[PDB]
Amino acid sequence: QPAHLCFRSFVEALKVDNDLVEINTPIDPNLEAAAITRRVCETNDKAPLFNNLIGMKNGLFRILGAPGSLRKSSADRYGRLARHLALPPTASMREILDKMLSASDMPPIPPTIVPTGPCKENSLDDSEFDLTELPVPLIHKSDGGKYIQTYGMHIVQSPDGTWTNWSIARAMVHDKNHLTGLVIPPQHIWQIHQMWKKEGRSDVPWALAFGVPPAAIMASSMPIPDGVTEAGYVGAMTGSSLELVKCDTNDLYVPATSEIVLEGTLSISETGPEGPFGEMHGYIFPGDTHLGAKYKVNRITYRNNAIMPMSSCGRLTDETHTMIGSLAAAEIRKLCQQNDLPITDAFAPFESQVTWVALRVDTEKLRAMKTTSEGFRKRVGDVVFNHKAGYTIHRLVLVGDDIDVYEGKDVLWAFSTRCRPGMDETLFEDVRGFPLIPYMGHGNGPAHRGGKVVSDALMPTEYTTGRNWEAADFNQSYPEDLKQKVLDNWTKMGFSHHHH
Amino acid sequence: QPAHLCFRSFVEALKVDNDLVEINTPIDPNLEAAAITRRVCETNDKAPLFNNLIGMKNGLFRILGAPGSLRKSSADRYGRLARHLALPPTASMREILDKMLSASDMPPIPPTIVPTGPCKENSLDDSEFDLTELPVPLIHKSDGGKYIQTYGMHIVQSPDGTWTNWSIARAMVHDKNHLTGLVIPPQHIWQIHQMWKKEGRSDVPWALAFGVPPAAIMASSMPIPDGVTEAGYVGAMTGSSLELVKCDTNDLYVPATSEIVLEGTLSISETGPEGPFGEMHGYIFPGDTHLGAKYKVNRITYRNNAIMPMSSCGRLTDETHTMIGSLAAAEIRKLCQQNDLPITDAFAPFESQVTWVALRVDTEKLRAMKTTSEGFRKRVGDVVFNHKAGYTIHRLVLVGDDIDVYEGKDVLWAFSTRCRPGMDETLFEDVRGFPLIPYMGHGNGPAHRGGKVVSDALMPTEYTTGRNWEAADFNQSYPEDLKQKVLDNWTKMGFSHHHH
């Protein structure tokens, strides 16, 4: 099975890429696995595969950390993400995001039901498992529970059957047969949960599949539109119908090659303590426990020698930055274009802790609009901040065509030098806010509202007659022939490889 | 003579440090020298010494580029600045800024007059030189003149004789015996010029000394207080009285070992075209010429084999960032402390194009003040933005004690995650603005007023009961013994030097 369609194959691909360290000595799921993974993520090292996890029994489970984190070299920086998608390991961010958007004007390719798959190699009923007895990791020392779920996909379906959503949302072990987790607006798991609650008749049929096809976990992390079944989107993106098997205890369908599957229900009535957790913005607030959604597990099925993927999230750089930020930015780019805004590119700078998105503007198109900064900022902010794809993003930075938004140094340069604080900005207080940002949920204002801004780093003539400067840099401040001469004589003179 | 007291010795020190490339083949002052220097600055390479400058005649002149720029290694990143000050090459920024502040509560050590020095080895009178015939560099392709003056020190004295100021301000060749340059409020050269203009009797006696003692050029770049003679400040900082020689044609005094000295007058009546220039924020606006101050040169004196230092300024990283930003930040730190504000450290992040200063707060002291963000932001902004030391700085970022303000990644993290846009900020429109920032002079609002902000990245409990989070990082999210175990086993497991 190809790497993008089968997690086990993906692990092999990371090995073959010399992007994996197999650790075959005993490693403690209580902090040690996550500490190693955290160090990996902070240093862009090889992904760790913990084959000898203390507490592993009857095949449950090995751990792969850092599945979507960065590689050290520039040339294959995003290679792990490329390996989720059948792209060359040298693929650019633009190419990765274009691949993730490609299915947006394609017909869905619905999944194919098959009678069995590797995820059915082992099972444990309601009398055979205990979630507290599995080697579930404690990821950060102050976490309020052992977070089994950092890189699996929740599967829930609308009551009417017409939409099946796949998404990543955290969850931790509550007791032998329950999890608690985040289920918050405007997320699709929340939207579907609300439908079931308003119907009022039953708990939500649910499955949580770990070690799913990599292409599927990428879509699970992306805010594709309301009502769109991720499986068909992934089918279209990959050009292949995904093979799914029915759950044993409900009529949901899971990827055939899933490493581990939990089957059960998401309660429409019950809650339990959830969090705190060391989160994407780099913080944990110890003791901040709150009631979360409560999941009941009825059955576990799993592959022989099952592998659980894990995100040891926090400070830069991990899946919560590479995937949440970049994939939100991708959807925002498309949303802007669909609203007739002249946006060519979007990226969430890592430097902003993926709380900003930089929007590259086609300034020829902007000039033809014959508009102003005030007007344009308002229009862009209304489009983005009123939409779910803008949920996690609190600052939009508009930049002209000279800026590569995938290069944080250049975004910061433009922001710092082209956007006059206050005057060149529009604040948005009457929009949904992202409470997990510390300045929101632990800040001075409403946790769930406001705190958003559009910062216009377009210069005045970019709206009128065209850019009126040159950069004071090597590239722009010297003629071509001179630059080439300098380059050609550089080592000869005495001054100081692409792959590395 | 020590390196910090004699530019020629400083050049030797850079050689000995393996931080110099001598280029002994012909190099064109028309763009080529500056292009090489620009490349050096963008890549943190060795400083270039152009010993064979096309147009050099009768000893005028060689060029040293990048005198205060960065070295590639982390361990001696700021070594060129350390070499200006007799500090070890491994000195931290904190140590460099403390050295630059040390003279602020010391008695001045006034200079010593000596009868001659190396700067008198050669001379050219009013009938022997022509500034248009010297190998003055064209630094950026669109510059409005050949900028002879990027790293010399202007010397002007108050009419009453009581204050002699040393400062860096740019100047370009106007004709055979005149320069034009920037002389703008609130700078000390401008303040002194105004005194002479109000007296109305004569042009300002002036000298411009190039290749001065390194310790002197550092003070020349620092906003030490009004009325304070830089020579005595440098004397106190270095513990040594600086040796000065009288000019031939006026009664000003120049460093004995100056490489090149221009003597003349700064007009109280005449102006001439000045600029545009590729400036510190990374831009040039071609054709933006404006009237500047006009200097008449009456005499040149110089060392045998004189060396002209040059800053090829623009995009990161050069003297305009390392010196302007850091030294303003130093003075701001002191100013805040003198105003009873609990600031421990200040730095202008390079990422902000040195337009921000991050202020590290002693939050134990803050808590004892029993204040609020609104109140504290206003107080800090009033102190800084109403003072000359705040002139160049448009955003102040307040951070708590966990943040190392000398580390831009950490400042950006704190800014992005702890300061709610709008609500946690105070805008200042009725303060002097820095027009050279593009969003000021080429922006949507008044070039000279406003556009400043205090951004509070202190979290709420930092004002009350104390920090209430731990970072979700390797350092803070795992116990000591586990961290050390991970580190000790890191290479054994299969994962990846301080000097490099």
Ligand SMILES: CC1=C(C(=O)O)[C@@H]2CC(C)(C)c3c(C)c(C)cc4c3N2[C@@]12C(=O)NC(=O)N=C2N4C[C@H](O)[C@H](O)[C@H](O)COP(=O)(O)O
């Ligand atoms: C914000 C999130 C997390 C957190 O920071 O704690 C937490 C951490 C983990 C689990 C590691 C994590 C990883 C590793 C990745 C890659 C993404 C997320 C998360 N977690 C959170 C969460 O628990 N709640 C949430 O609101 N969305 C999260 N996403 C992002 C969502 O997947 C994304 O917004 C999708 O678009 C949602 O799908 P649809 O609803 O559009 O179908």
Ligand SMILES: CC1=C(C(=O)O)[C@@H]2CC(C)(C)c3c(C)c(C)cc4c3N2[C@@]12C(=O)NC(=O)N=C2N4C[C@H](O)[C@H](O)[C@H](O)COP(=O)(O)O
């Ligand atoms: C802003 C400046 C420049 C510019 O960007 O064009 C220009 C570029 C050069 C010459 C390379 C340059 C270098 C290489 C360095 C290291 C510093 C400066 C400059 N230039 C400018 C300038 O021409 N006008 C100005 O307002 N101040 C400048 N400084 C900073 C001042 O020296 C500083 O503010 C001092 O505090 C002033 O001394 P006092 O008045 O307090 O005594």
Ligand SMILES: [K+]
């Ligand atoms: K999704």
Ligand SMILES: [K+]
């Ligand atoms: K702007």
Ligand SMILES: [K+]
């Ligand atoms: K000065």
Ligand SMILES: [K+]
């Ligand atoms: K704050």
Ligand SMILES: [Mn+2]
């Ligand atoms: Mn969805």
Ligand SMILES: [Mn+2]
């Ligand atoms: Mn001064």
